[PDB]
Design a protein around this ligand. Structure first.
Ligand SMILES: CCCC#Cc1cn([C@@H]2O[C@H](CO)[C@@H](O)[C@H](O)[C@H]2O)c(=O)[nH]c1=O
Ligand SMILES: CCCC#Cc1cn([C@@H]2O[C@H](CO)[C@@H](O)[C@H](O)[C@H]2O)c(=O)[nH]c1=O
Lengths: 810, 810
């Protein structure tokens, strides 16, 4: 069908069809009279997985023989999504399977829709993990993702009467054809117990044992025959466990609960024991696996030349005292030497500066659960604070600020402080974010060790986020410049000499129109909701958080509605405003925000005066596979975090890649996107970081905006008075209250400039042709935002390994 | 190698080898450098399972087209053991795989040893289920086993300092290649709630929902290409379940605990809620599956002509009120008609008369858990007691004795009474057992409905219990008479004209000698224990229970030991006495018995005066696959239950089939075995049933035996005084106590006659040739004890279907 989806050679198609029928008969134990479309999905999925395995085995073999430095990416989240289409794209099988399945009388696309998302993440942090893995394999690095195999991932979101309801995400119900259980590599992990001191050193004893059983998932590189491994641990009880006989067997579940469920908090710390067990679990089991692999090559000086461990935020920060524990207590190296190895091995990536998101573990927790690690942490803190003392003599306030140990109410360990002390490199995830670390929360650490601090601006994989979700756009780009851009995204610059080409202008507009027709139809079929496809598609999708200011967007929507009612017969550029995202379960304000959005939709969508000029849709169950549909269909990308709060953002990059214009604050990667496209090709508004700081020190008084801006006062009164909630007049008193008296994110301060920048957007949209040329200018400069670039920088500047675009033999 | 294991045709062997390598590469994702013998087992197992599936699909299809009456065997236990070798035997693949694996440089036998037993049963009742399934498939009946898929089966037994220790049997750890999950046929099952009465009839509401997910296991017939289905249900939570978010997800395990673990009590009732949930669960989910299958053929008069449900004891007795519930509350048939259908559909098999084993459920339990079923039960009891009243007017004591409802302390439902009332046929499991039912516990029910009562003497499958475990013996039998006996065991009679053939005598003795050498070597390799293979192998293996009188055997062993010490230089026929079996966890006396046995072994096995004349070995972890090794190696089979307590026994049959002589009481099937072999070819001793009854009514006084039998007094004093437990002189005071004052099983009363019958055994053993001719006479008359005969009788006399030895096409 389309040229970027590979060859459909007669030999391949005939071969695919017979393996499909074999799996249906032998693996699935069905015949064609009883098979449902789900069985068809599995047969296709098993048939596609056969193509990986040979490559997977050879790649693991090549690494054994060639013995390169290995990268270990430790993360509590891997937000993978579906694997089938991605696997086909990376093996060039897409058109062959399309053809093969067509001939069997099946629709491949209808089959793809049956696959469950692997939702083993919350949002951006877990999704960066997934892009990173795809990029490591594409660049031929000998790289292993390590995490937890959660039985339940991020919950499924349902809306009932405008409120979010949470349902268990039972993603394994039908089986997962992508994983291979490896019970032969089960490893013990210890908890509780106590520390004995001997002649021979410390010993950790009387521990409970949880077993960690690994599951391997293949991660294929783009068309290079590399297939790396994502290893996820599952918790299993030992067999003498407790060993009522009955009750002892039933209690085996208290051990296995460690890997049962992903914690649904995003940018918010919760200090729960079960979460700490999860953190230790992945770290303890992964380090033994790493040491084991290293011993099959006694002399640990070469350890840092054979091993890099990346920490995906502070979730796996216990890797640091754990590496020490093993090195000092079990291998019996002296402190100083183990410490050199540790620092040289480990590196730390920070993903936020929000105070409520940082990990600070109560000492009484570590004390019970991990008494040895606490001793090690105390020792680390003591020797660290002696370097600080020595370099800044007499500065006693520095010592209390830098301490890994926080005093006060209950003593806590600051886990970020631990990571900085124990890593040779620390990085933020966009340039402005990295500067903020150096200027604010990590300032003291920077003056002590400037050479640790770096930036590695985030990116996204152009395989999932362009080829896979947007084949139409990929195809027209490939007609003009070839296919090489898919693994070298900088090549999109060449699209700049097509900015005045009339055929290209029309092709970009045509693709966008198709994606919108397809998305509108998906809204009607799967959610009985009616949208006008000629409207501007104004979309904000990401987790629900006050810092992301979904509330700012709400105020704009209500403003547009009020203007329509004031002058009904005046022309306005019509929009569909879509907003989506999950709220963490205990986060009451986020849940109120979701309810406000649908309340606004109840009023606006049923006003006959509005017609099809304005539509407000809340997109249910936002997740990876829903992003692959809505992103290509969007015209305006909303990236409107208060400046200084969005560390980087990655959705922003998804939208730029796929031909939507961006309205955004100078926050996070937005600053670098605008700089790449040129600020003229970007809808920038609102306070900079500097302005936010000026307003803080003076005092943020919301009443001031409410007094000076009549459009805003009318919205607040409408909110206060029951206009959007006629049966519960006082439903939104929490929101108005926070807006008026405790807004940490200054929603009013950006309101005026946001509404005005929004009119500039509608104006550009009235001129289809200039809208599209600006789109071409975005797409054409999105190259920097490939995770291949991000990973090459990690490889050269942190891991000390060289990337490779070379094919391995087939 | 041996002719009964099929052809090894060049085409088959070449084909087997390539599928083996395919599975190793594609299913297991290993290559030959990294594979361990466990991977080899799996590759063989997957390669063998491919041969079933085509047959499995065609058999399920044939039943759809031909629409015969279906048999449903409902049981809480399926004691399957290993599947690989059995599968090869039934498909005639054994020598081909042997050859195929030989050429790949593997030992098939070493591979077979890696398979976990499916220990989803306790002992004889669960094992009869397994023989029955094999026989139903061999006889071409359209028959389905239904049960629970336990995550943990009967516990693994370890001995630590002579005491039993219990370990979780984690049989699924590595996966089960034999089962196919079928999550598409998940069914809801209800609990708790309450009953509402409407205009329209009763409604059961406000229930908790547990989902039942089915797993299908193939059951292949012998060489006839029939492959039937064993369907086992797993408990799953619904997704809105509880829906802390965290805690709600973790609590999903309270629902799934239903299928977590098999209750380890054998011949002992425990009234625990979790057990009742298990019973309802299998019954509720199986009946919907049955009704569903029946509707794909509204008029329920034909239901009994399309469906038979066998109840494997009273465990699934709730099938009766449940069938009523569905028929009356959901299909809205009137009471009388639903009741006719129910009785005509259901039949009940009783497996014991022991009072402590019978199920009597406290009403307060059914009331909370199954309020509707209780109402239905009350109604059943009322209409039943009106037939009784009408047929025996004024007999008020009969009414209290026959009531499904027992009065007293706490009210209970007698589940046996329910089964008799609601079934068209009730059967015991051996002739004497069936007469006892008619004369004692079910006498009143018999006078009301004589036509319900039948006998169906148990049997065992000659495929597992001869061909599979004893190929040597099968081969020499086949040389003389052909192969047809394997599915027509009555043909072994022909062996009678070989009783005076010198070559046959030597071949039978030679096989026995081989099995003993092989078993002795298995004892040294796997348990570092040293045995003399020229000794008589005296074996008692079965669950540990006072009724089975392992204690009687102990007294004999101690007697032999004391005779040796009295006259050390007198010749005695040397023996290895092996005793094995599991004790239920809370059954203190059974655990004392195990400890006594090993205590006897500590003394006897280290006395230099004894030499290798007497050895006492306790066989650890007795289970199905350990039975397939020890049974063919045995000379004397010990079947020594007090007369009237062993309903049938089936081990007894295993041993007769495999060339051991039997020492036994006239109990259970022993009566019919002796009658088939001739009492001269059998070592019968002790009280008959009549004698036991005479002693009861007079009073059993143990002191009397202790006063008259000096050999016995010496054993008791030795026990009392610390001879067998030097460090805890009083260790066995519980045993001596029970023996002296509360023996419900009259161990002393049979002691004298047992010791004397034992000397007669040693005497016959001194003359190898006459020992062997007696063996030939046993083997040759074991035909009656084929479960094919048992099942043909169930088919003709209860189910109303005709068996079929016809091959289905390949
Ligand atoms: C203990 C660690 C806590 C921190 C954090 C988190 C950061 N990010 C996102 O991480 C994404 C990947 O770097 C960024 O693009 C985005 O700006 C940022 O909010 C998340 O999506 N969730 C988080 O919990
Ligand atoms: C509620 C039902 C209770 C009863 C019973 C049981 C019977 N049998 C055995 O069932 C075997 C199969 O019929 C017999 O050979 C044997 O004599 C008998 O003890 C068991 O092995 N376990 C039992 O629990």
């Amino acid at each position: 069908q389309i040229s970027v989806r590979g060859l459909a050679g007669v030999e391949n198609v005939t071969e695919l069809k017979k393996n499909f029928n074999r799996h249906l008969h032998f693996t699935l134990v069905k015949d064609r009279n009883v098979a449902t479309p789900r069985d068809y999905y599995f047969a296709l999925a098993h048939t596609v997985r056969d193509h990986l395995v040979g490559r997977w085995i050879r790649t693991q073999q090549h690494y054994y023989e060639k013995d390169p430095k290995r990268i270990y990416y430790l993360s509590l989240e891997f937000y993978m999504g579906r694997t089938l289409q991605n696997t086909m794209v990376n093996l060039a099988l897409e058109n062959a399977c399309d053809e093969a399945t067509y001939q069997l009388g099946l629709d491949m696309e209808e089959l793809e829709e049956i696959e469950e998302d692997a939702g083993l993440g919350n949002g951006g942090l877990g999704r960066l993990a997934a892009c990173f893995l795809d990029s490591m394999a594409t660049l031929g690095l000998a790289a292993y993702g390590y995490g937890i195999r959660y039985e339940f991932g991020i919950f499924n979101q349902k809306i009932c009467g405008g409120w979010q309801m949470e349902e268990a995400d039972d993603w394994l119900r039908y089986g997962n054809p992508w994983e291979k259980a490896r019970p032969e590599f089960t490893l013990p992990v210890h908890f509780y117990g106590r520390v004995e001191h001997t002649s021979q050193g410390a010993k950790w004893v009387d521990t409970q044992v949880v077993l960690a059983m690994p599951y391997d998932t293949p991660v294929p590189g783009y068309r290079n025959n590399v297939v790396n491994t994502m290893r996820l641990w599952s918790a299993k009880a030992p067999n003498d466990f407790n060993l009522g006989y009955i009750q002892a067997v039933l209690d085996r579940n208290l051990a296995e609960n460690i890997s049962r469920v992903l914690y649904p908090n995003d940018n918010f710390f919760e200090g729960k024991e079960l979460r700490l067990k999860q953190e230790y679990f992945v770290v303890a089991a992964t380090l033994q696996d790493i040491i084991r692999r290293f011993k099959s090559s006694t002399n640990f000086d070469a350890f840092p030349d054979k091993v890099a461990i990346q920490l995906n935020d502070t979730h796996p920060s216990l890797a640091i005292p754990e590496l020490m524990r093993v090195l000092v207590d079990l291998e019996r190296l002296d402190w100083d030497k183990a410490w050199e190895v540790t620092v040289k091995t480990c590196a730390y990536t920070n993903h936020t500066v929000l105070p409520e998101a940082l990990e600070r573990w109560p000492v009484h927790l570590l004390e019970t659960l991990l008494p040895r690690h606490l001793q090690i942490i105390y020792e680390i803190n003591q020797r660290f604070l002696n370097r600080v003392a020595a370099a800044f003599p007499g500065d006693v306030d520095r010592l209390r600020r830098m301490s890994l140990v926080e005093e006060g109410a209950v003593k806590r360990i600051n886990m970020a402080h631990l990571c900085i002390a124990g890593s040779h490199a620390v990085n933020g995830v966009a340039r402005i974010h990295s500067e903020i670390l150096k200027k604010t929360i990590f300032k003291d650490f920077y003056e002590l060790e400037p050479h640790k601090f770096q930036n590695k601006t985030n990116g996204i994989t152009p395989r999932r986020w362009l080829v896979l979700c947007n084949p139409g756009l990929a195809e027209i780009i490939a007609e003009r410049i070839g296919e090489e851009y898919i693994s070298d995204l900088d090549q999109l610059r060449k699209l700049l000499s097509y900015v005045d080409d009339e055929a290209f202008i029309r092709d970009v507009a045509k693709v966008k129109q198709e994606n919108k027709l397809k998305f509108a139809a998906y809204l009607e079929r799967e959610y009985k909701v009616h949208i006008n496809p000629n409207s501007l598609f104004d979309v904000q999708v990401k987790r629900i958080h006050e810092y992301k200011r979904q509330l700012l967007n709400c105020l704009h929507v209500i403003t547009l509605y009020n203007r329509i009612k004031k002058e009904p017969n005046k022309f306005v550029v019509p929009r569909t405003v879509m907003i989506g995202g999950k709220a963490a379960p205990g986060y009451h304000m986020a849940k109120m925000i979701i309810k406000l959005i649908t309340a606004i939709g109840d009023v606006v969508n049923h006003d006959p005066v509005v017609g099809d000029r304005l539509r407000v849709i809340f997109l249910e169950n936002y997740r990876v596979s829903l992003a692959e549909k809505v992103i290509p269909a969007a015209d305006l990308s909303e990236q409107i975090s208060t400046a200084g709060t969005e560390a980087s953002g990655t959705g922003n990059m998804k939208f730029m890649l796929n031909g939507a214009l961006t309205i955004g604050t100078m926050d996070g990667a937005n600053v670098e996107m605008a700089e790449e496209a040129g600020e003229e090709n970007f809808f920038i508004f609102g306070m900079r970081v500097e302005d936010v700081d000026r307003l803080d020190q003076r005092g943020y008084n919301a009443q001031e905006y409410y007094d000076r801006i009549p459009e805003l006062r009318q919205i607040i009164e409408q909110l206060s008075s029951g206009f959007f909630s006629p049966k519960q007049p006082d439903l939104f008193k929490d929101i108005v209250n926070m807006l008026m008296h405790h807004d940490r994110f200054k929603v009013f301060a950006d309101y005026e400039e946001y509404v005005k920048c929004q009119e500039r957007v509608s104006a550009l949209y009235k001129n289809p042709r200039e809208w599209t040329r600006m789109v071409i200018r975005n797409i054409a400069t999105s190259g920097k935002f490939s995770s291949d670039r991000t990973i090459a920088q990690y490889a050269r500047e942190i891991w000390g390994v060289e990337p490779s675009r070379q094919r391995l033999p087939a």
